[PDB]
Design a protein around this ligand. Structure first.
Ligand SMILES: *[C@@H]1O[C@H](CO)[C@@H](O[C@@H]2O[C@H](CO)[C@@H](O[C@@H]3O[C@H](CO[C@H]4O[C@H](CO)[C@@H](O)[C@H](O)[C@@H]4O[C@@H]4O[C@H](CO)[C@@H](O)[C@H](O)[C@H]4NC(C)=O)[C@@H](O)[C@H](O)[C@@H]3O[C@@H]3OC[C@@H](O)[C@H](O)[C@H]3O)[C@H](O)[C@H]2NC(C)=O)[C@H](O[C@@H]2O[C@@H](C)[C@@H](O)[C@@H](O)[C@@H]2O)[C@H]1NC(C)=O
Ligand SMILES: *[C@@H]1O[C@H](CO)[C@@H](O[C@@H]2O[C@H](CO)[C@@H](O[C@@H]3O[C@H](CO)[C@@H](O)[C@H](O)[C@@H]3O[C@@H]3OC[C@@H](O)[C@H](O)[C@H]3O)[C@H](O)[C@H]2NC(C)=O)[C@H](O[C@@H]2O[C@@H](C)[C@@H](O)[C@@H](O)[C@@H]2O)[C@H]1NC(C)=O
Ligand SMILES: *[C@@H]1O[C@H](CO)[C@@H](O[C@@H]2O[C@H](CO)[C@@H](O[C@@H]3O[C@H](CO)[C@@H](O)[C@H](O)[C@@H]3O)[C@H](O)[C@H]2NC(C)=O)[C@H](O)[C@H]1NC(C)=O
Length: 602
């Protein structure tokens, strides 16, 4: 017999209905199941009709694996899935949140907070375009991005993943979506999923909803706010995402007024599906359903029931798939979860797969491997890094000569600080490892290397990680560039109540600036206590977490381009003010949202 779902000339809805009408319960629940590569095997994927795989942070085939190695791994998993009775291709997901960041040699773009500082949605679209290509270079078809959290408290470990505390800036940056997925047609219906084809990836608006609104910025915690506030701060960018055809939405670990998002039928079904008319698929976060209960995973039967009834379509298990499949099967067999709910989840998952061309191109394209770390993408990352920089100070008094831009020609210059020659530090979390890492973890250019690449051949560059005051004063230096700040962190490990940079940092700045005129480059995922750093420095730049392309920093330091970045967040005077956002009754910032000094290119 002719098999309609296999016919590439047929409309998506027809293909979805045709395939769905053929599937067993096992095949349906399989589609709903996403498993980590570390638990996947050809037999597992085939026997359990698995619909999706992911790499968690740092979950890689080998350290230093080539683009081809990634393609081979993904294709190996795909072969097993294509060998099932129905041959439904799996979709492979990954956190490609600032480039294809788990991958060695991938271009690492500035984190979201810095991109907010650029106020350049077209730059962000271009970054999405480049990211899609580097993700496809590794055979992966699905990026868990963008995070459209509106971070309202910088004590949150994920504040750097938020473009801004101002939802209007977050809304504007949803341009990442058509970058990743491709532009939607003129005829497009808001809420439908869209991916243009094999050179693009499925995107993911996350984390629904109010992840950036938790008390004291506590990660995964309670967002306490009335519906009006939830709707005018935390929700709006989701509607922009619907208008741009975002393929998937990931649910937040957080709660809204005490109700776990992963169990919230009102918001997931009532609002996202039934009001916004979202027609792509809804995915849990990592063990998100487990964390509905306290303790997490103490009643997995309840977790499955609550999340699936709430309207989630695909569960990022990601390890204990046997338990997940067994429990869900039992719930359906016992009539506790109706077939209509299962059929809805599967319809959505298949819709996205058919729409994106996955049935036509289930395997990696070897000719895409060369897109990984490609120079054009690094040039874009370098542009982004430079545009993200916010100049906070450029002279100690109103009568001082501006320090920046610095001359490329000088007899001798000093580069200093824990962050001057540390690629891992300048990239921050979600880089190679989940939590990021220290040192030369990938291909890139540190601030020190960027300085050496920029300066006149006659200028002697001296590096000292933590020089004492005497070394600096006796060194015969024309000026110094000193880089300090936060260490890499991700999620809960980044939650921080004091927001004071680790030492040595301030001590190094004080020692260097005490001895010679200094430009301080602050590396951070967020505003941090900055008055002491300011007090010591002739100039100070908030560089955020600029990524692999440290020449973005020197492009502005040496005046190849003027500074243009403006704060996408309020800079607080002290942490005891927090939360404190532009518009509050008490608003007493050190630097207001939108603040930024400028220079002109020399
Ligand atoms: C303000 O709040 C901050 C958040 O709570 C807090 O930072 C945290 O401090 C705690 C200790 O109190 C750290 O936990 C421990 O981390 C140890 C290893 O830490 C190094 O490596 C990790 C990455 O693996 C980095 O994140 C750390 O910054 C640290 O980096 C090292 O720092 C040195 C000094 O700057 C450098 O010279 C060195 O090069 C550098 N190394 C690297 C690789 O970058 C572990 O060994 C411990 O076991 C402990 O880990 C915790 O154990 C319990 C478990 O439940 C936790 O989940 C686990 O994390 C924590 O890493 C750190 N968080 C950061 C920085 O993100 C501030 O404390 C200050 O800074 C820290 C780093 C210490 O110097 C403190 O003495 C200092 O007080 C808070 N600040 C103030 C003023 O109170
Ligand atoms: C010395 O530096 C100053 C400060 O940067 C330059 O003035 C700025 O020039 C920008 C244009 O390059 C102006 O931004 C634009 O503003 C208009 C209207 O608001 C907007 O339509 C543009 O899109 C653009 O806005 C940017 O868009 C991209 C975003 O990422 C970015 O955040 C936006 O700002 C900016 O307003 C202007 N600032 C001031 C205070 O005047 C100055 O550039 C020169 O003068 C300006 C006014 C403009 O005519 C430029 O063409 C011209 O080069 C620069 N001087 C020199 C010699 O270059
Ligand atoms: C928001 O964050 C707070 C602070 O972490 C959460 O409260 C904490 O909840 C945990 C369990 O989820 C508690 O740990 C347990 O404490 C009991 C003793 O009461 C002990 O028997 C267990 O072994 C375990 O250690 C913790 O006490 C509690 N902390 C405080 C100070 O309240 C809260 O649950 C989070 N809210 C949301 C909605 O996520």
């Amino acid at each position: 017999d002719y098999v309609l779902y296999k016919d590439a000339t047929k409309p998506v809805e027809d293909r979805v209905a045709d395939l769905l009408g053929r599937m067993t319960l096992a095949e349906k629940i399989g589609q709903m199941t996403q498993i980590e590569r570390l638990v996947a095997t050809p037999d597992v994927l085939r026997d359990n009709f698995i619909g999706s795989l992911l790499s968690g942070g740092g979950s890689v085939p080998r350290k230093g694996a080539t683009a081809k190695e990634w393609q081979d791994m993904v294709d190996g998993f795909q072969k097993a899935c294509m060998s099932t009775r129905l041959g439904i291709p799996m979709i492979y997901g990954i956190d490609a949140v600032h480039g294809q960041n788990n991958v060695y040699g991938a271009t690492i773009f500035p984190h979201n907070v810095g991109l907010g500082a650029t106020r350049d949605p077209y730059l962000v679209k271009r970054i999405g375009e480049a990211t899609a290509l580097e993700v496809r270079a590794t055979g992966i078809q699905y990026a868990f991005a963008p995070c459209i959290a509106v971070c309202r408290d910088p004590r949150w470990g994920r504040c750097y993943e938020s473009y801004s505390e101002d939802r209007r800036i977050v809304q504007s940056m949803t341009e990442l979506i058509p970058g990743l997925q491709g532009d939607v047609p003129k005829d497009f219906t808001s809420g439908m999923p869209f991916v243009a084809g094999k050179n693009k990836v499925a995107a993911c608006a996350k984390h629904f909803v109010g992840d950036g609104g938790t008390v004291d910025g506590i990660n995964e915690n309670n967002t306490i706010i009335n519906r009006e506030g939830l709707m005018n701060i935390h929700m709006p960018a989701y509607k922009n995402a619907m208008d741009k055809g975002v393929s998937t939405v990931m649910i937040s670990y957080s709660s809204w007024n005490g109700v776990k998002m992963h169990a919230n039928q009102d918001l997931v079904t009532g609002y996202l599906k039934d009001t916004l008319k979202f027609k792509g698929f809804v995915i849990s976060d990592w063990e998100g359903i487990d964390r509905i209960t306290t303790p997490a995973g103490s009643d997995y039967s309840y977790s499955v029931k609550a999340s699936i009834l709430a309207g989630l379509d695909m569960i990022m298990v990601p390890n204990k798939y046997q338990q997940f499949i067994s429990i869900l099967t039992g719930h359906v067999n016992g009539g506790v979860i109706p077939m209509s709910r299962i059929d809805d989840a599967v319809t959505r998952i298949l819709r996205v797969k058919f729409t994106m061309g996955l049935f036509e191109n289930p395997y990696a394209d070897p000719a895409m491997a060369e897109q990984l770390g490609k120079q054009e993408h690094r040039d874009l990352a370098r542009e982004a890094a430079r545009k993200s920089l916010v100049l906070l100070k450029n002279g100690k008094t109103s009568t001082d000569a501006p320090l920046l831009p610095l001359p490329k020609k000088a007899p001798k210059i000093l580069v200093a600080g824990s962050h001057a020659d540390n690629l891992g530090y300048q990239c921050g979390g979600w880089t190679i490892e989940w939590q990021g890492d220290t040192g030369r973890t990938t291909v890139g250019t540190t601030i020190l290397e960027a300085v050496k690449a920029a300066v006149d051949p006659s200028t002697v560059v001296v590096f000292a990680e933590n020089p004492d005051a005497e070394f600096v004063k006796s060194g015969g230096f024309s000026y110094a560039i000193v880089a300090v700040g936060e260490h890499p962190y991700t999620e809960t490990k980044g939650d921080n109540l004091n927001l004071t940079i680790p030492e040595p940092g301030l001590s190094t700045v004080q020692a260097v600036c005490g001895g010679v005129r200094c430009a301080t480059v602050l590396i951070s995922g967020r505003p941090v206590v900055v008055q002491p750093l300011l007090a010591a420095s002739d100039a100070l730049v908030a560089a955020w977490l600029p990524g692999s392309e440290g020449q973005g920093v020197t492009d502005a330091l040496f005046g190849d381009f003027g500074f243009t970045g403006r704060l996408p967040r309020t800079w607080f005077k002290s942490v005891d003010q927090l939360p404190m956002n532009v518009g509050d009754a008490h608003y007493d910032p050190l630097f207001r949202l939108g603040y930024g000094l400028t220079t002109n290119a020399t």
